[PDB]
Design a protein around this ligand. Structure first.
Ligand SMILES: NC(=O)c1ccc[n+]([C@@H]2O[C@H](COP(=O)([O-])OP(=O)(O)OC[C@H]3O[C@@H](n4cnc5c(N)ncnc54)[C@H](OP(=O)(O)O)[C@@H]3O)[C@@H](O)[C@H]2O)c1
Ligand SMILES: NC(=O)c1ccc[n+]([C@@H]2O[C@H](COP(=O)([O-])OP(=O)(O)OC[C@H]3O[C@@H](n4cnc5c(N)ncnc54)[C@H](OP(=O)(O)O)[C@@H]3O)[C@@H](O)[C@H]2O)c1
Lengths: 432, 432
């Protein structure tokens, strides 16, 4: 709405802030992609100075001796306010500090919640009553996990959206590769191109694959609280299912395409376990390196974890365009290849023919694109509240059943394609 | 029309007969793919016996000691009649010999003209008056070159079709790889699928590529009489252009799809040299093997040959479906890869996006499929007389101009992608 922007990093002392957030805003400022008049303000309980943040974060900056002038300018635009996350006086100090900056009373404010969502309820409250700009826009960036089921997500989201409009809520998701956004871009373009062809008349089966050849790598502890369905399927694979199956949007506005994605989701009924194959990866005896260790051989994984690191799930969009057309979401860690593709198999009328939309994967690198998008106000690659609600609805009964009965996942060897029962499922619903 | 078939190999003493024809009919008979009651009769001037043909041709049979019983049966069904190609008495001897075979008076007769087309006029005449079956069908297989320009091809074809109906004429073309027919099959299937999408509205440019990484390999002598346009472009690339651009056929009959191919061809006007880039390959100094030798370093190439071994040509289908959409035919010998693909570039509305139809290339192996097709009467992968006429019309003025002015082709290094002027042409008509 003007030229002056303030970038508040709530929880600036943390791991995401030090390893990713500060480096990428460095890279955007260095390449001249931030607005010219930008200030960066960190906020957390620990009593730090900008010197401390620089000391602990510049190792990740890829700072070269050529750049040490723009780097000094960048840190000149940096400040840090210490305070508690539910202390009114602390937010008063933060707000008045922002107001003291050059043109701060009327600058746009971008709050990025580098904080465990367990504190979100407090932060979003205090921001709402203490730190929002009266003239500039106010955009919050929330971070995963967007709850862990329909009920928890519903509670958190209903809280956040009772304080901010949907065009102020940016739910960012950026942990699956530097090309994460190009995926969705080319899928949208393919939907626009092949729209007339993507019917139940030509397509017999659609599959959506996310394979990674590496394991949890000494961090199975974190992953174990969530599982492969919450990690990849409920968020990303389901988004690209939407992009494939959606109708033509009314325009190219973010909210028209998001309307169409939500319409697609509202046609998918809840998945039962008979259409689900879960798997856990064991160590490769003959391989070397991390391939020798399995999932339970990760020290951070609790003994007896039935958490699935691989899942194959069958969903159905139930409308006139798609009916009985199976959408097979297959994903897993510690597999044979690093592939993220979408294959559509065609009704033979003559070996079955399929159209493959693959995203070659080894300027902005998806995360940088999302920050720039919140700066520009483009909400397209951010999940909407109703979209998120529908995703959780689709997957919550299954997740509850898994947590309740704890079915032992099928073992598969590190570097394999996964359980053969997943191939069994695909064949059972009709594939080849 | 019955169970008894006679396979007459006119010119059985030749190179195609010994190295390819006899081996593949061996392979079809061995795998039980020929009709149970089949006889093989060779015919040529040289006074041979079946023992001679076996001696000189079984090296190419891949004959294994397990198979030496079906092999003796196969050669038991073999006979050889010697005679002249314009001697009435010789064809009388051939015809009466066929009549003497078991059920020969009423067997289907399949004449395969393993002969330089310079004699075709005689052979097709005498067959027509001496050796056609009165009860069974009579199918002739003619061989390249189907003339060298519109006039010569027109003369030869008008002669052959004044003696045989079009459903008796099988113009076979089978020298570009064991997967030559799968190419056209998947292209037809793609036309059927993406029909509604393939418009001037979505497509900005279509390219059709035939690259080979090997040179002429000590046989530039033969190739030099024809050139890369007659060798690859006027026949194969143009056929697959037709398969891409055609309307939906009235049915799946061979003649309906061939009607649509001819309709496409009748919309392409003659190509002038300003849309043509010709190239000749020179030896790679730093490479090794045959890559050190160029085209003129082939001993069988006459000194000073301006024959092009690479060509990039732009054609336009002129109808409502395609208008100003450039079809770029690019092909050459001694290049960087062995690739045969069709790329369709799309109108961006956002780097340009293209749909790639590639044919993976390293049961029947295309040649075997064509022989089986003539046995079954499927004319689909054989060029029709009007289709051939249109191809020659499109390319004859350019070929005449090349033969008349002898433009020196652009040199390109063995293993290169070819002349940069071809990239210039593609860019000039709009590509990236
Ligand atoms: N794949 C994923 O889903 C994924 C990956 C990475 C990050 N994330 C999300 O990104 C966010 C960043 O977390 P992080 O891993 O970077 O670091 P973090 O250590 O979780 O949190 C950073 C800051 O949060 C404050 N904090 C942490 N736990 C707290 C608590 N129980 N009560 C109050 N304050 C607390 C501390 O600030 P002070 O002590 O200085 O006050 C700490 O420096 C989280 O929301 C996390 O879920 C998600
Ligand atoms: N890429 C291509 O375009 C390509 C590749 C291979 C073959 N072909 C075609 O396939 C056919 C087979 O030819 P080929 O290479 O296998 O062998 P060929 O040596 O050309 O001819 C085979 C037989 O033809 C007879 N013959 C040859 N020249 C003759 C002449 N001037 N007058 C009369 N009879 C003659 C001889 O029979 P006798 O002496 O025993 O009577 C000879 O054994 C030709 O039509 C050729 O164009 C095309």
């Amino acid at each position: 709405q003007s030229d002056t922007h303030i970038f508040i990093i709530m929880g600036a002392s943390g791991d995401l802030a030090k390893k990713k957030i500060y480096p990428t805003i460095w890279w955007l400022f260095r390449d001249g992609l931030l607005p010219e008049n930008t200030f960066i303000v960190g906020y957390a309980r620990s009593r730090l100075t900008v010197a401390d943040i620089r000391k602990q974060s510049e190792p990740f900056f890829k700072a070269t001796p050529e750049e040490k002038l723009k780097l000094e300018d960048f840190f000149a635009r940096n400040s840090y306010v210490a305070g508690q996350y539910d202390d009114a006086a602390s937010y008063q100090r933060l707000n008045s500090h922002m107001n003291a900056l050059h043109l701060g009373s009327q600058a746009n404010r971008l709050f990025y919640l580098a904080l465990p969502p367990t504190v979100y309820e407090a932060v979003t409250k205090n921001i709402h009553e203490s730190c929002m700009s009266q003239i500039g826009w106010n955009r919050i960036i929330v971070e995963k996990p967007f709850g862990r089921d329909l009920q928890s997500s519903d509670r958190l989201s209903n809280h956040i959206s009772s304080l901010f409009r949907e065009d102020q809520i940016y739910r960012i998701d950026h942990y699956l590769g530097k090309e994460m956004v190009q995926n969705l871009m080319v899928l949208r373009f393919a939907n626009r191109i092949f729209g007339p062809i993507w019917n139940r008349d030509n397509i017999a089966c659609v599959i959506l694959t996310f394979k990674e050849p590496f394991g949890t790598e000494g961090r199975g502890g974190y992953f174990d609280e969530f599982g492969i369905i919450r990690d990849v399927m409920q968020n990303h694979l389901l988004q690209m299912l939407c992009l494939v199956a959606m109708e033509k949007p009314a325009s190219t506005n973010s909210d028209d395409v998001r309307d169409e994605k939500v319409k697609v989701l509202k046609c998918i009924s809840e998945v039962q376990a008979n259409n689900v194959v879960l798997g856990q990866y064991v160590g490769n005896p003959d391989g070397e390196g991390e391939a020798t260790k399995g999932y339970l051989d990760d020290p951070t994984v609790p003994r007896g974890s039935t958490t699935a690191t691989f899942a194959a799930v069958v969903l159905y969009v139930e409308n006139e365009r798609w009916d009985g057309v199976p959408f097979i979401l297959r994903c897993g860690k510690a597999l044979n290849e690093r592939k993220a593709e979408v294959r559509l198999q065609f009704h033979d009328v003559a070996k079955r023919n399929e159209l493959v939309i693959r995203v070659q994967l080894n300027l902005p690198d998806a995360y940088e694109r999302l920050i720039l998008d919140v700066f520009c106000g483009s909400q397209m690659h951010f999940v909407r509240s109703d979209e998120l609600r529908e995703a959780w609805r689709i997957f919550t009964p299954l997740l509850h059943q898994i947590e309740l009965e704890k079915p032992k996942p099928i073992p598969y060897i590190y570097g394999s394609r996964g359980p053969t029962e997943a191939d069994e499922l695909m064949k059972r619903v009709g594939f080849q």
